[PDB]
Design a protein around this nucleic acid. Structure first.
Lengths: 124, 242, 49, 93, 173
RNA sequence: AUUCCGGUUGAUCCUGCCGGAGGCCACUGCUAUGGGGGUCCGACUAAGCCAUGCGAGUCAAGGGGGCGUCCCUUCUGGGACGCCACCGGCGGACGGCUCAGUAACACGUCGGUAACCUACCCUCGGGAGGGGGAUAACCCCGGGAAACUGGGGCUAAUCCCCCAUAGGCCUGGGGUACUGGAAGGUCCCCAGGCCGAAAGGGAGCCGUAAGGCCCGCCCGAGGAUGCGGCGGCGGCCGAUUAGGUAGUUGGUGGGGUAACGGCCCACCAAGCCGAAGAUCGGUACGGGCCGUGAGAGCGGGAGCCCGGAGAUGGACACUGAGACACGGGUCCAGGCCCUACGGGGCGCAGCAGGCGCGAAACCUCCGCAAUGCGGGAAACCGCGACGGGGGGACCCCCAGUGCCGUGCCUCUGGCACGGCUUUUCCGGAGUGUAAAAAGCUCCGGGAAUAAGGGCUGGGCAAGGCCGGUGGCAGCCGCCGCGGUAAUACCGGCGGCCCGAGUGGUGGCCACUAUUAUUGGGCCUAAAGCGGCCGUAGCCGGGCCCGUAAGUCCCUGGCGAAAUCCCACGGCUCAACCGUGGG
């Protein structure tokens, strides 16, 4: 169970025993791992209180926004660099802050694909 | 352990504002969510069965509520868990009986009888102002109700002001503002059920609310928070206030 | 406690007192230990066996 | 001897609630029928539309309290009253 | 939450002096068991405790409780109507013992003997304020003290009952 | 209410400890507990095992079928009632039960959520277009000992689905009106993309149809119910447990969550806690409260309310707004029930009851009502919630088991005579069952029909003679008694205490200034060290200037209820409850 619960060790290091079992609300979900592809693949997820979260498993197009403010729905070629983790750039995995190469050029992503379902970026 | 919402209420757990024999039976009618807060309301079933003595047992109160022979602020309400709070007008046209619920000096609630012409005015405390798309201003009142006005009329209103409302048709009659000298009735605190005149403000930063200073009818000076200062008049009360 | 008597034992009193006091060694059901138990009342040990 | 203390009228229910004291010094506590027959006399009520709730005879007292109830129509009585009280007074077998 | 006893046991229940004092307070007033006497001591005791608490106490609420104390002591008929918070200390066990209903009926002459008064009380032939009380240990207010009469249905209310005239002549004699 | 007394010596004083003397809680002897009124009962052991019955449902005004009957018309067929089960909306996550676990932001209080969610609720603004599809019940048909379950035709829904647009989300740029101290958010325009609404309805009045009433569906925005996580302070023992921690602590940048957060990931750096007791171990649900005491204080957390947590141990997932869900599901372990043996299914720390354990805790009961919950707008329905009752020397309050006059004694108490009430029993009548009883309440015949337990040498003053025993039998909380004369052993009599109770054991507070802050001792009895130095810590010269942390006074909010104290009122007073005050 992907448990986003309490830490199990005190700030002093005393090992804390578990006083109670895990509850439904304190567990997360798997890492989406958005990857580049020829089409966009999406999945809807029921969440706390009946809300929905849309999750992207394949990425093909991006919304590059001009410094002026216009938008352009272009295609994605490859990820340039992933400062969050070195493994992710190699495996063509897209997350917020990643610099990606498109037909326009270099774009830094300023949207979380794992929750928004869409990739929005600013060109450099 | 608990796995979801509460559906009962032990009588001993009843709020402090209710005239109820706490050691009669185990349970009490849990109020449903509604206009006012838990702190400042009561199910009308107690109003009918107990404060009026019209019904002895609960079953007959179910029946009388089903017949819809009551008007809470000009609306028949058959929901026996409905919470009736502060400044709401209970109206029984059959007996021509009109009362208003007001807090007591001890902090409990009581039915002050009122005339017919008073029966359709209700004061609403403007709890907040929120803008809705299309630029429509929305006043959220102290009793879980809302009203919409226009942008040009936003200057007229402010939070914590009072609005005397023709409740049976939801029409704004007048708005009592806040400035020094308004006549004010206190809702909560040890100064509950006190009527006086505003004297001075006390701005406190860091989440510490605003405190007004009230002078009593004879001139005694005391203090109380903002949200308890229910304005009813600018010079004299506009309603029969015990 | 409740127990089973295993033997009747008499005991000499402590001097300067002189006399013979009857009692029984009892094994206790609750934990199994064996302990002595004084019998009170004159002419009473006959009724414990 | 019966003497009233208060009579109230629930206009919402259309009902008369009456509280009365029975002086029966040296007398056994009266039944329901006799008190009904006497009470209906001076109050000008239809006995079939009248029922008696309780006749509480206190300890060491010759005054017994009584609480009685008078409707204006049969159907309000049938629709509002619980069955068992009608059965006690005999208005339902 | 438990309902505690209302009376108190003596700290050493084998003092000769206290035992004999209890005995001479028992024989005269003819109480059944020492529970009653100790209870009758106890209400005196906490009256004195209240007196001591309030005498030193300051603040308006102290005054209110003091006035209520004096008022109820007067209403009991235990004190003269002009008393102050001082003389409440000097009360005695006998002062309460007179205020007992069983004592009052005897001092009204309705009974030749103490136990006769008790028997009449428990047998319900004595009424107060139009109501019958079956407890000889009941404490009587001042205002009620003139309403003590025979129970109306009781034969003893009848002047010709075969148990009335000896009482009457004993009162006269 | 601030109490002492017996016991060290030939005799005295002191120290010091032990025993008596009181209350509360368990177990238990005897004895009744007759009567009544308000309260508790597997509370420390086996959170061991359990046959059994019950404990959770309701809606056919959403929907469409079938069955029975009534009536009318009968080719048909409508309407009334009931049944069937299904679709389906809601409920079954609350309520009941227990204290194993846990030394913890589990709990108490005070603040913050701007870093969240929210089905049933209330209110302001708006919407309900078009179209499509699904299979129960029933008729044909079958297995097995069963659980359970196949297959053909068949039907409609507010059942499901697509599109239309609002709207939901995310981002870049540009402005600005608002809550607010501010933040950021909210408001508007432009730009880019993703997702993406509904549901009408039975009856009835008028109405040809419509249209007005009733119930119901959906979007935006709040409020409110319930909840989630964040913090300060508070509150055990062990130093014969002194160093501890490895994502362990922080920074950068991200994943995941409803939501902030090492919660998780990658990189970087070496941090975080400890003598003001880290770590480890023992121990324990926390609080309001409860027992004792003059009070400082000491102890205890079972019955009731709040918060916490749990379902044989562990682990895991669906549906849901809300669960990893006592009477939903799967696996392991472990125990067990049925079976042509292929396989199935069980789970009382729910009510009632059994086995086991042990010193130790009850009826396999009656109603869905008074209160209160889900459903149905309504009637009403169910509830081992609850309310009644059943057993019990569970707690507290009241009450007697004879009274009076005469005469004699044991004149204190009893004895005989005469009269008197009828503390129970029998009958009638009220509440009341939401039915009988509940013996409650009023009336009629009427016994004088329920009193025992302990002690009798002294501390406890507390109560004295005669027989049997003769260092034996025997008695005792301590001191002490008995080897012929026993006021202390057993029996008789007498007397003393308490009384429907009394006795025995165990546990807890007082006694105890034998834990000493108030308030203890260390030359000779327990105890000042074999000496000096000095760190933290503690205590610290006088005067003047300043601050105002402590200290004190006034004032705002708050520290729930029940419980504690007091007056009045209700049940005959009281216990219990109400209003008011503290």
């Amino acid at each position: 169970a992907i448990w986003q619960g309490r830490s199990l060790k005190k700030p002093s290091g005393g090992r804390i025993v578990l006083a109670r079992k895990k509850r439904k609300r304190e567990l997360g979900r798997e890492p989406s791992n958005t990857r580049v592809a020829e089409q966009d693949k999406r999945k809807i997820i029921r969440t706390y209180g009946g809300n929905r979260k849309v999750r992207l498993t394949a990425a093909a197009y991006a919304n590059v926004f001009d410094k002026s403010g216009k938008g352009r729905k272009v295609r994605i070629i490859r990820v340039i660099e992933n400062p969050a983790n070195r493994q992710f750039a190699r495996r063509n995995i897209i997350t917020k802050g990643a610099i990606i190469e498109t037909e326009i050029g270099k774009a830094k992503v300023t949207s979380r694909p794992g929750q928004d379902g869409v990739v929005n970026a600013i060109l450099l | 352990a608990r796995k979801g919402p509460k559906r009962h209420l032990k009588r001993l757990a009843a709020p402090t504002s209710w005239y109820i024999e706490r050691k009669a039976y185990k349970w009490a009618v849990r109020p449903r969510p509604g206009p006012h807060n838990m702190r400042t309301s009561i199910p009308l079933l107690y109003i009918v069965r107990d404060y009026l003595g019209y019904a002895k047992t609960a079953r007959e109160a179910r029946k009388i509520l089903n017949e819809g022979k009551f008007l809470v602020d000009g609306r028949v309400r058959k929901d026996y868990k409905f919470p009736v709070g502060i400044m709401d007008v209970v109206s029984i046209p059959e007996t021509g009986e009109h009362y208003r619920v007001l807090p007591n000096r001890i902090g409990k609630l009581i039915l002050h009888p009122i005339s017919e012409d008073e029966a359709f005015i209700k004061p609403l405390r403007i709890r907040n102002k929120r803008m809705i798309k299309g630029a429509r201003v929305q006043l959220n009142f102290h009793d879980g109700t809302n009203h919409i006005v226009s942008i040009a009329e936003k200057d007229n209103y402010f939070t914590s002001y009072t609005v005397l409302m023709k409740v049976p048709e939801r029409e704004i009659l007048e708005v009592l503002p806040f400035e020094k000298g308004a006549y004010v009735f206190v809702t909560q605190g040890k100064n509950v059920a006190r009527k006086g005149r505003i004297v001075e403000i006390k701005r406190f930063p860091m989440g510490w609310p605003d405190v007004v200073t009230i002078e009593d009818e004879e001139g005694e000076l005391f203090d109380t928070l903002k949200e308890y200062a229910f304005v009813v008049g600018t010079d004299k009360p506009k309603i029969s206030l015990p | 406690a409740r127990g089973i008597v295993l033997e009747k034992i008499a005991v000499e009193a402590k001097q300067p007192n002189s006399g013979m006091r009857k009692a029984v060694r009892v094994q206790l059901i609750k934990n199994g230990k064996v302990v002595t138990a004084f019998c009170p009342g004159d002419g009473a040990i006959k009724f414990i066996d | 001897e019966i003497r009233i203390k208060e009579i109230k009228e629930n206009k919402l229910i259309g009902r008369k609630e009456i509280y009365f004291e029975i002086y029966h010094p040296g007398e056994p506590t009266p039944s329901r029928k006799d008190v009904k027959g006497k009470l209906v006399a001076m109050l000008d009520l239809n006995p079939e539309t009248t029922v008696i709730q309780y006749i509480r005879s206190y300890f060491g007292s010759y005054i017994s309290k009584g609480y009685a109830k008078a409707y204006d129509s049969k159907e309000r009585m049938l629709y509002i009253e619980p069955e068992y009280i009608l059965i006690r007074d005999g208005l339902i077998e | 939450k438990r309902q505690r006893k209302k009376y108190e046991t003596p700290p050493h229940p084998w003092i000769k002096e206290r035992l004999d004092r209890e005995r001479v307070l028992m024989d005269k007033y003819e109480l059944k068991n020492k529970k009653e006497l100790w209870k009758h001591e106890t209400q005196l005791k906490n009256f004195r405790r209240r007196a001591r608490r309030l005498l030193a106490a300051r603040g308006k609420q102290a005054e209110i409780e003091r006035e209520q104390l004096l008022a109820r002591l007067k209403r009991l008929g235990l004190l003269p109507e002009d008393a102050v918070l001082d003389d409440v200390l000097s009360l005695t066990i006998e002062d309460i013992l007179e205020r007992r209903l069983q004592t009052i009926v005897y001092k009204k002459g309705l009974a030749r003997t103490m136990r006769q008064a008790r028997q009449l009380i428990v047998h319900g032939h004595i009424e107060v304020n139009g109501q019958i009380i079956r407890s000889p240990s009941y404490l009587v207010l001042k205002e009620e003290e003139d309403t003590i009469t025979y129970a109306r249905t009781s034969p003893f209310a009848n002047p010709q009952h075969p148990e009335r005239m000896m009482i009457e002549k004993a009162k006269q004699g």
